Design an enzyme around this catalytic site. Sequence first.
Site, PDB file in Angstrom:
ATOM      1  N   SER A  46       2.728   4.937   5.411  1.00 29.12           N
ATOM      2  CA  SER A  46       2.773   5.461   6.774  1.00 29.12           C
ATOM      3  C   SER A  46       2.326   4.491   7.865  1.00 29.12           C
ATOM      4  O   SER A  46       2.430   4.808   9.058  1.00 29.12           O
ATOM      5  CB  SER A  46       1.995   6.772   6.872  1.00 29.12           C
ATOM      6  OG  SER A  46       2.750   7.822   6.289  1.00 29.12           O
ATOM      7  N   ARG A  91     -10.697   5.920   2.351  1.00 25.87           N
ATOM      8  CA  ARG A  91     -10.228   4.773   3.111  1.00 25.87           C
ATOM      9  C   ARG A  91     -11.132   4.577   4.317  1.00 25.87           C
ATOM     10  O   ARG A  91     -11.580   3.472   4.584  1.00 25.87           O
ATOM     11  CB  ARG A  91      -8.772   4.980   3.540  1.00 25.87           C
ATOM     12  CG  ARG A  91      -7.798   4.983   2.370  1.00 25.87           C
ATOM     13  CD  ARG A  91      -6.451   5.570   2.759  1.00 25.87           C
ATOM     14  NE  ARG A  91      -6.601   6.806   3.524  1.00 25.87           N
ATOM     15  CZ  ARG A  91      -5.596   7.612   3.855  1.00 25.87           C
ATOM     16  NH1 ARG A  91      -4.356   7.323   3.485  1.00 25.87           N
ATOM     17  NH2 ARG A  91      -5.834   8.707   4.557  1.00 25.87           N
ATOM     18  N   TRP A 118      -0.684   6.086   2.664  1.00 19.76           N
ATOM     19  CA  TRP A 118      -0.951   6.454   1.270  1.00 19.76           C
ATOM     20  C   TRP A 118       0.364   6.731   0.579  1.00 19.76           C
ATOM     21  O   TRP A 118       0.941   7.795   0.758  1.00 19.76           O
ATOM     22  CB  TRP A 118      -1.859   7.686   1.160  1.00 19.76           C
ATOM     23  CG  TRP A 118      -2.297   8.015  -0.266  1.00 19.76           C
ATOM     24  CD1 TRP A 118      -1.732   7.562  -1.435  1.00 19.76           C
ATOM     25  CD2 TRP A 118      -3.392   8.856  -0.659  1.00 19.76           C
ATOM     26  NE1 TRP A 118      -2.398   8.079  -2.511  1.00 19.76           N
ATOM     27  CE2 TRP A 118      -3.421   8.875  -2.066  1.00 19.76           C
ATOM     28  CE3 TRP A 118      -4.343   9.603   0.045  1.00 19.76           C
ATOM     29  CZ2 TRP A 118      -4.368   9.604  -2.785  1.00 19.76           C
ATOM     30  CZ3 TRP A 118      -5.281  10.329  -0.671  1.00 19.76           C
ATOM     31  CH2 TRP A 118      -5.289  10.319  -2.070  1.00 19.76           C
ATOM     32  N   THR A 173      -3.534   5.157   8.992  1.00 23.00           N
ATOM     33  CA  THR A 173      -3.673   5.253   7.542  1.00 23.00           C
ATOM     34  C   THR A 173      -2.304   5.262   6.890  1.00 23.00           C
ATOM     35  O   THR A 173      -1.319   5.664   7.496  1.00 23.00           O
ATOM     36  CB  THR A 173      -4.385   6.539   7.114  1.00 23.00           C
ATOM     37  OG1 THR A 173      -3.623   7.663   7.562  1.00 23.00           O
ATOM     38  CG2 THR A 173      -5.776   6.618   7.703  1.00 23.00           C
TER      39      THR A 173
END
Length: 239
Positions: A45, A225, A185, A183
């Site tokens: 992302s 994270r 993932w 972020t």
Amino acid sequence: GHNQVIHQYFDEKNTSGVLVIQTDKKINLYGNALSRANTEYVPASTFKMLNALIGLENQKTDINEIFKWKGEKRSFTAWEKDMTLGEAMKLSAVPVYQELARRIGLDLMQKEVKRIGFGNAEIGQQVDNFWLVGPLKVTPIQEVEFVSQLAHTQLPFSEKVQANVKNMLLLEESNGYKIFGKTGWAMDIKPQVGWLTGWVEQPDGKIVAFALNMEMRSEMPASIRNELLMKSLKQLNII
Ligand SMILES: [Cl-]
Ligand SMILES: [Cl-]
Ligand SMILES: [Cl-]
Ligand SMILES: [Cl-]
Ligand SMILES: [K+]
């Protein structure tokens, strides 16, 4: 400013990762797997930063447009609602950005990705997933440079478009400090990869860019994270 502590941080969370720091074109590596920094991973992302840039610059959307939820079930209930590009940015709402990607189209998107030179710059044939499961791949060093340029408004897009995307990336604001970031993932590949890419604007306007990259596991809370980043930026005295 070390470096063995930060190694212990990664060691302790039982992960394999790297923290790439860039301060005025000087790059430092931290964590417990520094060789990751030059290893290509799917951006997941984090690519939303570039998707947005490409979308806005080419007028496929704007920051006010409301993307309609048309009822299909989504991966998160928080995604099942009408939202703007910026809201979708904050929630990593993939379906909005897939709608954007389809507006852009394969030709426009491929051309832009290579013009910017992002990672290996290959998007394949599916315009709406290339950043989640390949073929697009980028190194964490390549990401910190990318995000460093965005922070300094130095990417090959108009300044207003860059400022618009930067405004979508504010994560925390405390003590004259600003943390911006995105972020990522990638859950549908093995091994899984997690990202946290962004920068710190220090109270005197000094910018410090970072790219956290770590192997992930389904059992992990997403905020791992954030924790690994935040306590490292504190160790290096960036915040
Ligand atoms: Cl080092
Ligand atoms: Cl190492
Ligand atoms: Cl308005
Ligand atoms: Cl789903
Ligand atoms: K270790």
